Symmetry: C2
Subunit: 175 residues, 2 copies
């Protein structure tokens, strides 16, 4: 009974972006910052609607990383949420099926940082990243020690999940 629409950020109205912010604030219970919202904008949104009420969301944003020393185009998953009373009905899974298709069509690798939410991602093919993770700090890479074990990856061309990943720079949490 849910309707799914895939829209680029550039195709959203101000009120649709506001409804997205509202859904994220309510669904994360205070764990979602302004930086997290900036991270949600600029790529593709998969949105779940009950009639006209936005009830679920996930975004896929392009990131430009290194896998060891090789450049890799990444589809990075952000702001995955389903309104509380709509949970445990398969909406999050449909969001991820749609997310996988977008990634397969556009990028060499899907990545995300997971809560927990890890089991849902595993059920649609994602695996824990086994290599070391690095982020830019003051223009120089350092270990993302806190995120290791939490980042998951998905490939439809095969990628070595034991290799090191070097993400690109942003505000807030780099992963």
């Amino acid at each position: 009974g849910i309707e799914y629409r895939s829209l680029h950020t550039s195709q959203l109205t101000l009120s649709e972006k506001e409804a997205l912010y509202d859904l994220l604030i309510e669904g994360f219970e205070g764990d979602f910052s302004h930086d997290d919202f900036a991270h949600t904008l600029g790529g593709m949104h998969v949105m779940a609607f009950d009639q006209q009420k936005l009830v679920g969301h996930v975004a896929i944003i392009q990131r430009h990383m290194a896998l060891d020393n090789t450049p890799i185009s990444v589809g990075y998953v952000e702001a995955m949420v389903v309104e509380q009373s709509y949970r445990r009905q398969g909406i999050g899974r449909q969001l991820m099926l749609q997310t996988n298709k977008i990634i397969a069509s556009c990028y060499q690798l899907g990545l995300l940082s997971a809560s927990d939410g890890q089991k849902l991602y595993h059920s649609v093919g994602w695996q824990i990243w086994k290599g070391k993770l690095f982020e830019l700090k003051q223009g120089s890479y350092i270990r993302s020690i806190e995120e290791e074990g939490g980042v998951m990856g998905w490939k439809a061309g095969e990628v070595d999940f034991t290799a090191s990943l070097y993400c690109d720079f942003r505000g807030g949490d780099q992963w």
Copy 2:
């Protein structure tokens, strides 16, 4: 008589993808590489059609950069082309006007790397030569992009960006800019 469509890479038919590749090889007279084509995929396409024939294209790719020490979200312009016989009719201008709207709605700053045929057109829709230092990752360490300094141009909707500040781009294959 030209129709414009804005489509994400994920919304493109396979037909349009192959048409795009041929259009770029034909339009660039030999200096459009496989890495250049990879750089074109993953973001928004603005496509111009004459009836059913694709005649013009520009892509806007999300990039994550540093402006001095500050993280900035970039709409990076790639793979700007109009088929030879359609040029000098304003199609490229319309492509950029559509590009400007996408950038304004999504990113903090527009950036591109221009040519001879490009600069004046981009300037005509508000873009300015980037005056600051440019840097790219080599072996995980930033170095100056001397080659590209003076050729990269930027665009800001509100217009409040220090065009003399340094830019550090994110990593990719082929040309980083």
